[PDB]
Design a protein around this ligand. Structure first.
Ligand SMILES: CSc1cccc(CC(=O)N2CCC[C@H](C(N)=O)C2)c1
Ligand SMILES: [Zn+2]
Length: 139
């Protein structure tokens, strides 16, 4: 679990969105596993606007942060799950690092701010949904 809170927006994994997220829907994209809902309170976070390929993510299944080198956002095949059929997930960045299903929502940050959230993983890999291209989150 986890979310990004920026301005009057809440960014979560689309497969973990609640009934309240869908009732306050701003934008969603199944191909990115992202959903953004509106909030009444002002959010705690800053979004990075950069091309960093290193950062640190929070891993809830270890209660620890880990440094990672990650690939640039790209289209990556993701096997079928209870939430989606087998498909290409876009804007996904991979890195070597521990992850389990409940780690989705953990934030990846660089020195400039929030880069994205855990969305996939397996076999010593961890995949992050990028949010740096969503310029409208800042206005
Ligand atoms: C098996 S270790 C693991 C680590 C992190 C996550 C997972 C689960 C996983 O990748 N998916 C299930 C939820 C939706 C995801 C998606 N973005 O399509 C795919 C598994
Ligand atoms: Zn950066």
């Amino acid at each position: 679990s986890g979310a990004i809170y920026v301005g009057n927006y809440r960014v979560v994994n689309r497969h973990l969105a609640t009934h309240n997220d869908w009732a306050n829907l701003v934008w969603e994209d199944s191909s990115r596993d992202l959903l953004v809902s509106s909030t009444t309170a002002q959010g705690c976070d800053t979004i990075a606007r950069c091309d960093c390929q290193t950062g640190v993510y929070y891993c809830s299944s270890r209660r620890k942060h880990y440094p990672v080198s990650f690939s640039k956002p790209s289209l990556i095949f993701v096997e079928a799950s209870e939430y989606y059929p087998a498909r290409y997930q876009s804007h996904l960045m991979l890195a070597v690092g521990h992850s389990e299903p409940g780690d989705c929502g953990g934030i990846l940050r660089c020195q400039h701010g929030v880069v994205g959230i855990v969305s996939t993983g397996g076999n010593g890999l961890v995949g992050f949904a990028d949010v740096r291209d969503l310029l409208w989150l800042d206005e």
